[PDB]
Amino acid sequence: TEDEIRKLRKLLEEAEKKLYKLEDKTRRSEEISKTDDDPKAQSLQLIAESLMLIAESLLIIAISLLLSS
Amino acid sequence: TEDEIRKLRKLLEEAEKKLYKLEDKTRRSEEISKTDDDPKAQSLQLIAESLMLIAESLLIIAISLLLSS
Amino acid sequence: TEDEIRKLRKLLEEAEKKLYKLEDKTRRSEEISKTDDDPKAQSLQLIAESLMLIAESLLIIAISLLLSS
Amino acid sequence: TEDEIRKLKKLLEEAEKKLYKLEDKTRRSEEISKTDDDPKAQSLQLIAESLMLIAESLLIIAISLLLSS
Amino acid sequence: TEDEIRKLRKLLEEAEKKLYKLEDKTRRSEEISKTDDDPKAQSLQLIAESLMLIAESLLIIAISLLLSS
Amino acid sequence: TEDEIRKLRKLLEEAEKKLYKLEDKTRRSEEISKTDDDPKAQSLQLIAESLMLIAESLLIIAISLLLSS
């Protein structure tokens, strides 16, 4: 309980830090989008931006489910 | 917990603000989606769109879960 | 905050209607590429279809969690 | 509240009816394609099956959350 | 009571076993990453593994959610 | 009773073990990536890292849900 819940919480903060690693790499991938490239590729970039937002939401739910228990 | 909890809603208002930010990019690319012969591109845009609506759902579930702790 | 639960339920059903449209766009798309000779395309079509379904169920969980408040 | 979970049940039962639809479609499509040349296409068969499994599970979570409220 | 969740447990253990099989199929395929060659394929392989990990997790959440009712 | 949760939590521990394995694979393949030609590929490595982050969050949620039941 109390120490694993602490381990869950450093797991959760390690995910936060992983998240800012990806928030930053999709921006670095958006800066590499210049001539507008290939349409399926454009869709790919947008797909990846969507899952980072999904990751963002699952992370808040994980934080909050930790707080709810 | 309310200071921890509202900073979680801080994050979630940033999250709404990003979702709408990306859905307009979907709408923008979804009318410039060139409906040519290859289905693979088409499926990718449909794929990205479902991903955006699921992200949407996760976002509201995240809203609900933090608010009904 | 009955107001916000109301407008949250608003977005919830606003999202239901966009999904029905999403799934309708894909019924058309996947149906009328009249003959298929592609494996990758074929699997992607299944991928989008599955995605839309979890969009479907996450939408339903979003409804239940909202009312479960 | 009485009619509300019936419409939720409506949605949930209609969803079941399509998961099973795509499980049949994935079943026969997934082994009617055996070109076997590049892990790209094979990894797609795999992703789709994985997605089919999460749709199953998410559907069960919706069923059970509805059972929980 | 005990048997209403049995009819549902019946469905969740079909799922575990079918997941039991997809992980077997992907690990053989993950084992056959013949030579090195394309990176896109490499990411697809990784994508597929993360999705069964996702599938595993929602499977266990589905179990616990069913145990909560 | 609580021993049932320990059987479940072990499956989650095996999930935790494989998660870090895939994580180790993803850092490893991102250094062997050494690609800057196609955005498609850059976004693919992004999709896989995003998926890794999500599965990861799902794991924290599953742990908490099992212990909260």
XYZ file of C-alpha atoms in Angstrom:
414
model
C 0.000 0.000 0.000
C 1.647 3.051 1.366
C 5.119 2.547 -0.232
C 3.883 1.032 -3.588
C 1.387 3.871 -3.673
C 4.476 5.985 -3.406
C 5.948 3.831 -6.214
C 2.803 4.368 -8.242
C 3.273 8.047 -7.642
C 6.900 8.062 -8.794
C 5.688 5.878 -11.682
C 3.135 8.602 -12.347
C 5.643 11.410 -12.152
C 8.002 9.384 -14.410
C 5.141 9.305 -16.903
C 4.717 13.066 -16.566
C 8.352 13.485 -17.463
C 8.001 10.949 -20.320
C 4.995 13.024 -21.529
C 6.827 16.287 -21.693
C 9.500 14.250 -23.702
C 6.781 13.458 -26.269
C 5.028 16.905 -26.174
C 8.315 18.242 -27.187
C 9.049 15.608 -29.836
C 5.676 16.122 -31.624
C 6.520 19.816 -31.714
C 9.919 18.892 -33.172
C 8.086 16.734 -35.712
C 5.716 19.577 -36.542
C 8.675 21.851 -37.200
C 9.900 19.294 -39.697
C 6.600 19.679 -41.662
C 7.391 22.327 -44.344
C 6.398 21.771 -47.918
C 3.224 20.043 -46.622
C 4.708 16.702 -47.696
C 2.416 13.588 -48.318
C -1.281 13.517 -47.391
C -1.192 10.193 -45.602
C 1.885 11.485 -43.793
C 0.061 14.646 -42.839
C -2.651 12.456 -41.438
C 0.023 10.537 -39.583
C 1.300 13.631 -37.913
C -2.174 14.476 -36.805
C -2.707 10.894 -35.595
C 0.311 11.118 -33.362
C -0.812 14.496 -32.013
C -4.125 12.781 -31.133
C -2.553 9.967 -29.149
C -0.446 12.379 -27.146
C -3.652 14.024 -26.166
C -4.986 10.577 -25.277
C -1.871 10.009 -23.218
C -2.439 13.352 -21.533
C -6.001 12.286 -20.622
C -5.040 8.836 -19.372
C -2.382 10.453 -17.270
C -4.840 12.769 -15.573
C -7.170 9.848 -15.021
C -4.373 7.834 -13.596
C -3.417 10.665 -11.260
C -7.022 11.104 -10.287
C -7.791 7.424 -9.820
C -4.807 7.396 -7.572
C -6.344 10.251 -5.664
C -9.710 8.614 -5.649
C -8.451 5.492 -3.875
C -6.782 18.289 -1.833
C -8.495 21.169 -3.541
C -5.230 22.819 -4.511
C -4.009 19.567 -5.983
C -7.435 19.052 -7.579
C -7.768 22.447 -9.272
C -4.254 22.210 -10.705
C -5.507 18.973 -12.199
C -8.319 21.046 -13.730
C -5.622 23.495 -14.831
C -4.140 20.719 -16.873
C -7.577 19.767 -18.182
C -8.427 23.237 -19.358
C -5.094 23.136 -21.261
C -6.302 19.837 -22.599
C -9.660 21.148 -23.905
C -7.804 24.036 -25.420
C -5.528 21.614 -27.294
C -8.364 19.312 -28.418
C -10.262 22.060 -30.124
C -6.920 23.192 -31.477
C -6.432 19.817 -33.170
C -10.052 19.262 -34.304
C -9.888 22.359 -36.342
C -6.737 21.056 -37.854
C -8.757 17.902 -38.574
C -11.572 19.873 -40.144
C -9.052 21.867 -42.106
C -7.315 18.784 -43.433
C -10.639 16.926 -43.787
C -11.871 19.282 -46.399
C -8.453 19.384 -48.053
C -8.514 15.619 -47.858
C -7.978 14.793 -51.533
C -10.457 12.006 -52.327
C -8.350 10.334 -55.003
C -8.248 6.574 -55.774
C -5.944 5.243 -53.007
C -7.982 4.065 -50.009
C -5.017 3.919 -47.670
C -4.919 7.670 -47.340
C -8.665 7.697 -46.853
C -8.504 5.151 -44.066
C -5.777 7.155 -42.398
C -7.914 10.235 -42.243
C -10.818 8.178 -40.959
C -8.433 6.635 -38.473
C -7.231 9.979 -37.288
C -10.782 11.231 -36.923
C -11.863 8.324 -34.742
C -8.798 8.945 -32.683
C -9.844 12.513 -32.173
C -13.302 11.582 -31.073
C -11.955 8.964 -28.614
C -9.561 11.526 -27.239
C -12.557 13.691 -26.844
C -14.364 11.064 -24.885
C -11.370 10.435 -22.668
C -11.172 14.061 -22.025
C -14.717 14.234 -20.770
C -14.245 11.107 -18.730
C -11.233 12.794 -17.214
C -13.334 15.846 -16.472
C -15.974 13.735 -14.833
C -13.703 11.642 -12.799
C -11.845 14.472 -11.246
C -15.030 16.382 -10.567
C -16.799 13.494 -8.966
C -14.083 12.422 -6.552
C -22.635 23.172 -10.950
C -25.709 21.875 -12.663
C -24.936 24.328 -15.476
C -21.650 22.702 -16.315
C -23.024 19.189 -15.984
C -25.664 20.314 -18.459
C -23.215 21.613 -20.985
C -20.975 18.589 -20.366
C -23.939 16.413 -21.276
C -24.317 18.788 -24.167
C -20.841 18.025 -25.495
C -21.488 14.398 -24.759
C -24.409 14.157 -27.103
C -22.713 16.600 -29.513
C -20.010 13.993 -29.767
C -22.575 11.169 -30.294
C -23.806 12.889 -33.413
C -20.343 13.543 -34.797
C -19.563 9.827 -34.300
C -22.672 8.649 -36.251
C -21.464 10.907 -39.118
C -17.803 9.432 -38.790
C -19.143 5.912 -39.075
C -21.334 6.880 -41.941
C -18.491 8.411 -43.730
C -16.678 5.144 -43.233
C -19.609 2.951 -44.312
C -19.547 4.878 -47.567
C -15.800 4.825 -47.924
C -15.127 1.235 -47.221
C -18.128 0.071 -49.194
C -17.651 1.941 -52.497
C -13.905 1.374 -53.250
C -15.770 -1.230 -55.471
C -13.054 -4.016 -55.787
C -10.055 -4.552 -53.329
C -6.642 -5.926 -54.308
C -4.636 -4.574 -51.323
C -3.751 -6.356 -48.057
C -2.444 -3.373 -46.181
C -5.457 -1.329 -47.170
C -7.720 -4.134 -46.147
C -6.189 -4.388 -42.698
C -6.237 -0.609 -42.297
C -9.875 -0.584 -43.131
C -10.365 -3.019 -40.287
C -8.180 -0.837 -38.082
C -10.302 2.227 -38.663
C -13.424 0.188 -38.124
C -12.173 -1.104 -34.760
C -11.114 2.357 -33.742
C -14.484 3.785 -34.381
C -15.931 1.110 -32.230
C -13.849 1.957 -29.234
C -14.838 5.497 -30.001
C -18.330 4.086 -29.739
C -17.777 2.435 -26.414
C -15.724 5.203 -24.860
C -18.609 7.412 -25.765
C -20.927 5.125 -23.884
C -18.590 5.093 -20.840
C -18.455 8.806 -21.017
C -22.258 8.913 -20.778
C -22.401 6.523 -17.873
C -19.650 8.167 -15.882
C -21.240 11.529 -16.344
C -24.536 10.363 -14.991
C -22.813 8.295 -12.363
C -21.952 11.540 -10.680
C -33.517 7.323 -15.631
C -35.605 4.329 -16.476
C -35.689 5.200 -20.153
C -32.157 6.532 -19.968
C -30.391 3.242 -19.246
C -32.661 1.539 -21.809
C -31.258 3.864 -24.484
C -27.849 3.254 -23.086
C -28.637 -0.472 -23.299
C -29.786 0.170 -26.872
C -26.442 1.684 -27.688
C -24.572 -1.005 -25.816
C -26.448 -3.849 -27.546
C -26.030 -2.251 -30.987
C -22.346 -1.956 -30.259
C -22.131 -5.623 -29.337
C -23.841 -6.437 -32.593
C -21.106 -4.674 -34.596
C -18.083 -5.908 -32.543
C -19.140 -9.394 -33.372
C -19.616 -8.293 -36.995
C -16.073 -7.093 -37.250
C -14.743 -10.062 -35.383
C -16.167 -12.231 -38.156
C -14.757 -9.812 -40.742
C -11.324 -9.726 -39.065
C -11.391 -13.517 -38.693
C -11.866 -14.310 -42.304
C -9.937 -11.296 -43.661
C -7.037 -11.861 -41.272
C -6.372 -15.408 -42.458
C -7.531 -14.862 -46.064
C -4.524 -12.554 -46.365
C -1.246 -14.411 -46.306
C 0.988 -12.607 -48.707
C 3.789 -12.990 -46.081
C 6.442 -10.624 -47.515
C 6.921 -7.674 -45.152
C 6.381 -7.273 -41.415
C 4.502 -4.159 -42.356
C 1.385 -5.918 -43.521
C 1.737 -8.677 -40.961
C 2.208 -6.148 -38.169
C -1.066 -4.589 -39.385
C -2.953 -7.876 -39.082
C -1.621 -7.934 -35.562
C -2.528 -4.360 -34.641
C -6.061 -4.901 -35.866
C -6.479 -8.012 -33.769
C -5.125 -6.081 -30.830
C -7.646 -3.333 -31.544
C -10.400 -5.852 -31.866
C -9.481 -7.095 -28.429
C -9.584 -3.677 -26.830
C -12.923 -3.010 -28.439
C -14.169 -6.215 -26.861
C -12.842 -5.223 -23.463
C -14.064 -1.667 -23.646
C -17.452 -2.937 -24.536
C -17.356 -5.151 -21.494
C -16.365 -2.198 -19.368
C -19.315 -0.282 -20.662
C -21.635 -3.194 -19.979
C -20.262 -3.532 -16.467
C -20.211 0.141 -15.647
C -23.775 0.249 -16.638
C -24.330 -2.706 -14.369
C -22.566 -0.812 -11.625
C -24.889 2.172 -11.806
C -26.091 -12.274 -7.743
C -23.340 -14.881 -8.069
C -24.611 -16.138 -11.459
C -25.544 -12.763 -13.075
C -21.805 -11.962 -13.065
C -21.140 -15.593 -14.078
C -22.775 -15.063 -17.469
C -20.477 -11.965 -17.870
C -17.436 -13.773 -16.411
C -18.098 -16.310 -19.039
C -17.547 -13.583 -21.605
C -14.449 -12.152 -19.869
C -12.693 -15.480 -19.739
C -13.272 -16.049 -23.468
C -11.397 -12.805 -23.798
C -8.428 -13.660 -21.599
C -7.765 -16.844 -23.573
C -8.128 -15.167 -26.908
C -5.669 -12.499 -25.677
C -3.499 -15.494 -24.474
C -3.357 -16.458 -28.199
C -2.712 -13.106 -29.763
C 0.306 -12.537 -27.575
C 1.563 -15.888 -28.654
C 1.075 -14.999 -32.292
C 2.776 -11.625 -31.960
C 5.730 -12.935 -30.057
C 6.435 -15.478 -32.812
C 6.151 -12.631 -35.266
C 8.223 -10.367 -33.017
C 10.767 -13.125 -32.934
C 10.864 -13.160 -36.722
C 12.180 -9.660 -37.285
C 14.259 -11.121 -40.159
C 17.599 -9.212 -40.425
C 17.084 -5.446 -39.728
C 15.947 -3.700 -42.996
C 12.935 -1.109 -42.824
C 12.410 1.186 -39.666
C 8.775 1.845 -40.389
C 8.147 -1.845 -39.976
C 10.180 -1.737 -36.800
C 7.899 0.891 -35.327
C 4.852 -1.074 -36.420
C 6.125 -4.038 -34.513
C 6.566 -1.865 -31.472
C 3.156 -0.341 -32.035
C 1.619 -3.770 -32.080
C 3.313 -4.792 -28.864
C 2.143 -1.646 -27.069
C -1.410 -2.340 -28.173
C -1.507 -5.787 -26.705
C -0.076 -4.302 -23.579
C -2.993 -1.894 -23.678
C -5.260 -4.839 -24.273
C -3.878 -6.619 -21.274
C -4.400 -3.653 -19.110
C -7.987 -3.003 -20.131
C -8.604 -6.690 -19.739
C -7.579 -6.563 -16.079
C -9.410 -3.322 -15.572
C -12.420 -5.032 -17.018
C -11.979 -7.865 -14.557
C -11.702 -5.541 -11.591
C -14.547 -3.418 -12.777
C -16.614 -6.562 -12.976
C -15.459 -7.433 -9.467
C -16.568 -4.038 -8.290
C -20.135 -4.946 -9.215
C -10.867 -12.525 -1.485
C -7.590 -10.542 -1.112
C -5.568 -13.478 -2.429
C -7.561 -13.260 -5.662
C -6.355 -9.702 -6.007
C -2.829 -10.929 -5.452
C -3.170 -13.330 -8.402
C -4.451 -10.430 -10.479
C -1.736 -8.091 -9.269
C 0.849 -10.643 -10.320
C -0.555 -10.655 -13.829
C -0.137 -6.862 -13.593
C 3.409 -7.374 -12.442
C 4.062 -9.479 -15.531
C 2.491 -6.687 -17.498
C 4.807 -4.239 -15.766
C 7.768 -6.444 -16.668
C 6.876 -6.660 -20.358
C 6.116 -2.906 -20.428
C 9.608 -1.985 -19.400
C 10.895 -4.548 -22.024
C 9.089 -2.806 -24.797
C 10.309 0.466 -23.317
C 13.789 -0.777 -23.497
C 13.148 -1.865 -27.057
C 11.791 1.593 -28.003
C 14.721 3.519 -26.723
C 16.992 0.964 -28.332
C 15.318 1.198 -31.742
C 15.070 4.983 -31.601
C 18.881 5.167 -31.426
C 19.160 2.635 -34.282
C 16.587 4.781 -36.085
C 19.132 7.309 -37.439
C 16.491 8.496 -39.942
C 15.626 11.995 -41.052
C 14.377 11.365 -44.626
C 10.682 10.601 -44.188
C 8.214 12.281 -41.875
C 6.180 9.145 -42.120
C 8.834 7.300 -40.189
C 9.453 10.109 -37.693
C 5.760 10.173 -36.952
C 5.716 6.380 -36.720
C 8.336 6.333 -34.030
C 6.153 8.966 -32.382
C 3.007 6.847 -32.578
C 4.776 3.992 -30.924
C 6.153 6.116 -28.115
C 2.726 7.614 -27.565
C 1.232 4.153 -27.359
C 3.838 3.158 -24.900
C 2.869 6.068 -22.701
C -0.807 5.153 -22.829
C -0.293 1.505 -21.929
C 1.846 2.645 -19.198
C -1.009 4.882 -17.860
C -3.478 2.011 -18.227
C -1.281 -0.049 -16.022
C -1.359 2.507 -13.221
C -5.106 2.642 -13.567
C -5.440 -1.109 -13.450
C -3.318 -1.370 -10.353
C -5.427 1.214 -8.661
C -8.662 -0.307 -9.738
C -7.714 -3.675 -8.474
C -6.667 -2.322 -5.114
C -9.686 -0.071 -4.872
C -11.883 -3.139 -5.221
